[PDB]
């Protein structure tokens, strides 16, 4: 009688009756918030896969009162690396599991049991493996307990040797030395190697309380027979069993898969279901496609959590509604979730997305169908995006809208030419109406074609950079002109335009012979900075030809300086006449490390020592809130005024060209 896949008994103490017939509990067992008010005893139960949890059970004095024959807790799935949790159990006096033999996986958590004795009387080192990670705190103090086994055997705990027992009447059962890793019957006759725990009969597959590997047809097999597959982690089932198993109900819930001789819930990472919902997984090349299916026909992306549900999807069976008013780093965060979406079965609506200046986060999206379209047969519908400068329609990208039209309205920063280039790749030239794309309220503030600002001279220090660009006469004589310098620390050159950019506004100088420049204040020595200037053309006469000026992203690295001292010098001696020494690279290298230079000087044997008469002494010497980081910083600042130019006891000098060890 297998019970599962999870027993959760709580509140009602009579609800414990669900264990009348269970001999094995497939899955965890929860006995919580029970208030006992005749007793209940379950000698049928012997094995529990996964873990066992007990919490706030009043009236229960010993665990032997419930599960006396419990032998193996497999711990296939653990409660936070714990296979047995006994927490806040009142009236409990001892762990009465006197038939417990092997806990295959996980640790034990025994906490807050003011009456729990017989803890030190149990040698947990022979029933489980990871005894180091066990948690036994807050129980009855051993000083005020009084553990006394009836009157059995005993063994060594640390350097101590004391008796072992589970309760006041039963002792801790052990196996003789001759069986080794094997198991033993109550009468100390070795159990079949594939057995585990006890035996109904010595050396027999069909006489086992619990198998150590797997189970099938009453036999403890090492591996499952050829036509059976591993289910959970203890028994073998046939193929027709897993064709009837159904996972937890979800939007895309399906049956179980057969893979690598195991019957699991979903195909593992790097695998996809062969065919159409078949029982077997096939290796998928590179990235494995995850089609995402949702109950809501129109998924609305109005926050950052809503986008997390589309993480890793390749195809979307539904409609996408983007509505992003707020968000700083969402331009790169949406690309994490939606960057792999390639096909959309429905339509895409970009409404009120003021935070989006572009749609580049929708990478790999190359197909939009039109199974359902907005009123008026629209498959692409943007509206009221006060900052949408460009689409994701770079001339490198690919796109195909199968059916539907495109409507654009109230997008002022979007150049009207960009959406004409869209329907080229989209393939909907002439399919839209005359009002679907209008130059009114669209591209009103757009500055499409821009000029080029040319840098003229750059000068570098260890912390300052002077850069000057050419004077820029605006396209119209009456425009007021000003500049804006964008500079930010960029370790490498792949940089996106404005974002943690530092900005400063410098005006065009009055004298026409001097060109506009800017001086940067405090920069890190030897650090590559990305700089580009942008013009501010305030046109008194609006539109006609809105024309800005933008420069290329210039990468300027400051000079190098004196490096920092090496960090944490440690040294040891593995042999006489030899000294190993390791360290860490300095805090502020300020350039390429190139090499280290180490020096070792012999130290004189201590003064005096030769002088004292050590036959009179009794001991002769031998030899082998927290702002302290700011304190140590002061002493590192002192080491800048003194450097080292390389070339009684003499110094020996050697160069280490690569590693931090010598």
């Amino acid at each position, epitope marked *: 009688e297998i019970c599962g896949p999870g027993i959760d008994i709580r509140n009602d103490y009579q609800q414990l009756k669900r264990l009348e017939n269970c001999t094995v509990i497939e899955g965890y067992l929860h006995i919580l918030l029970i208030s006992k008010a005749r007793s209940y005893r379950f000698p049928k139960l012997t094995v529990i896969t996964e873990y066992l949890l007990l919490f706030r059970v009043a009236g229960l004095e010993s665990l032997g009162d419930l599960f006396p024959n419990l032998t193996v807790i497999r711990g296939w799935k653990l409660f936070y690396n714990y296979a047995l949790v006994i927490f806040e159990m009142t009236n409990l006096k001892d762990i009465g599991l006197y038939n417990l033999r092997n806990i295959t996986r996980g640790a034990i958590r025994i906490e807050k049991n003011a009456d729990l004795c017989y803890l030190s009387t149990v040698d947990w080192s022979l029933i489980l493996d990871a005894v180091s990670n066990n948690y036994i705190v807050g129980n009855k103090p051993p000083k005020e307990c009084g553990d006394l086994c009836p009157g059995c055997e005993k063994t060594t705990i640390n350097n101590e040797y004391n008796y072992r027992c589970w309760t006041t009447n039963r002792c801790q059962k052990m196996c003789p030395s001759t069986c080794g890793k094997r198991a033993c019957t109550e009468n100390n006759e070795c159990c079949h190697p594939e057995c585990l725990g006890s035996c109904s009969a010595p050396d027999n597959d069909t006489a086992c309380v619990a198998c150590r590997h797997y189970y099938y047809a009453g036999v403890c097999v090492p591996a499952c027979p050829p036509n059976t597959y591993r289910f959970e982690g203890w028994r073998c089932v046939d193929r027709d*069993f897993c064709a009837n198993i*159904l996972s937890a109900e979800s939007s895309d819930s399906e*049956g179980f898969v057969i893979h690598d001789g195991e019957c699991m819930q979903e195909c593992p990472s790097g695998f996809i279901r062969n065919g159409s919902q078949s029982m077997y997984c096939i290796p998928c090349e590179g990235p494995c496609p995850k089609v995402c299916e949702e109950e809501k026909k129109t998924k609305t992306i109005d926050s950052v959590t809503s986008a997390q549900m589309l993480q890793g999807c390749t195809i979307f069976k539904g409609n996408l509604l983007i509505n992003i008013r707020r968000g700083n780093n969402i331009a790169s965060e949406l690309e994490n979730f939606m960057g792999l979406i390639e096909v959309v079965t429905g339509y895409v609506k970009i409404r009120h997305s003021h935070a989006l200046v572009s749609l580049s986060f929708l990478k790999n999206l190359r197909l939009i169908l039109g*199974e359902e379209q907005l009123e008026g047969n629209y498959s692409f519908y943007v509206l009221d995006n006060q900052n949408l400068q460009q689409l994701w329609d770079w001339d490198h990208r690919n796109l195909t809208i199968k059916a539907g039209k495109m409507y654009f309205a109230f997008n002022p920063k979007l150049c009207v030419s960009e959406i004409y280039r869209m329907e080229e790749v989209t393939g909907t030239k002439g399919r839209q109406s005359k009002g679907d794309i209008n130059t009114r309220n669209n591209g009103e503030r757009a500055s499409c074609e821009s000029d080029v600002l040319h840098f003229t001279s750059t000068t570098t220090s260890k912390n300052r950079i002077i850069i000057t660009w050419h004077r820029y006469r605006p396209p119209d004589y009456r425009d007021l002109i000003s500049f804006t310098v964008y500079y930010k620390e960029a370790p490498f050159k792949n940089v996106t335009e404005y974002n943690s950019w530092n900005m400063v506004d410098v005006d065009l100088p009055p004298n026409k012979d001097v060109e506009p420049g800017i001086l940067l204040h405090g920069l890190k020595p030897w650090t590559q900075y990305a700089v580009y200037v942008k013009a501010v053309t305030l046109t008194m006469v609006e539109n006609d030809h809105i024309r800005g000026a933008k420069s290329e992203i210039l990468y300027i690295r400051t000079n190098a300086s004196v490096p920092s001292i090496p960090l944490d010098v440690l040294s040891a001696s593995n042999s006489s006449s030899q000294l190993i020494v390791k360290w860490n690279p300095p805090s502020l290298p300020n350039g390429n490390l190139s090499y280290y230079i180490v020096r070792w000087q012999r130290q004189p044997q201590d003064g005096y020592l030769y002088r004292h008469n050590y036959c009179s002494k009794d001991k002769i010497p031998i030899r082998k809130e927290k702002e302290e980081a700011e304190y140590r910083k002061v002493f590192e600042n002192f080491l800048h005024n003194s450097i080292f130019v390389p070339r009684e006891y003499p110094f020996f000098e050697s160069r280490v060209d690569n590693k931090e060890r010598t």
Partner: antibody
Amino acid sequence: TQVQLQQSGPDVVRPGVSVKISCKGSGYTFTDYAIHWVKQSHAKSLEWIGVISTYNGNTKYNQKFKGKAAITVDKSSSTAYLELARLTSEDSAIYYCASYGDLYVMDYWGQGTSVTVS
Amino acid sequence: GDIVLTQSPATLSVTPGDSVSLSCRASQTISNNLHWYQQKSHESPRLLIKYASQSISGIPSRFSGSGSGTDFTLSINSVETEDFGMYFCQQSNSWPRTFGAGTKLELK
């Protein structure tokens, strides 16, 4: 083989009432096979409405019947149940119990339960 | 969306002894995940053909399935006086499970 599925008797109930249909398994391991439910009316003909896995207890419904049907199981009694609330004249049909197969095929079928909404 | 199974013709007037073939076409491609069922009058539908082609132990040799992909056919070599009923095809590759409208095999 001795496999058989016995469903509850016919029902004639007024509109707006809730009803549930039983289906007891026999001659086979009840926990080893899922149970499907199929609605056969005069219109739409055979309509699959849901399947329940007898092992774990999880279900999968047809979206046309999620807010209308509810499939439960009884491991001890070896019986599944198909609950139907706010019955309409449309739901007046014969419902069938199917098992001894898998989530893909319905090998054996029960005799059917006639629900008539007056 | 769902998968609709269109069974044509809706009714076949046959005399016992004639060989007939039923057809069940699908909207999307089903490859192999199609099954057949026979339902006589005042009975429950019983399985005839698993997975488009392979037959069931018990059903006579007259019933045979064919097709793979989007067009499937059920053949009956010499209809008997017992084979007069209504036949369905069952979709089985994508949720939800859907059936065909049904093809009545009545007496001509």
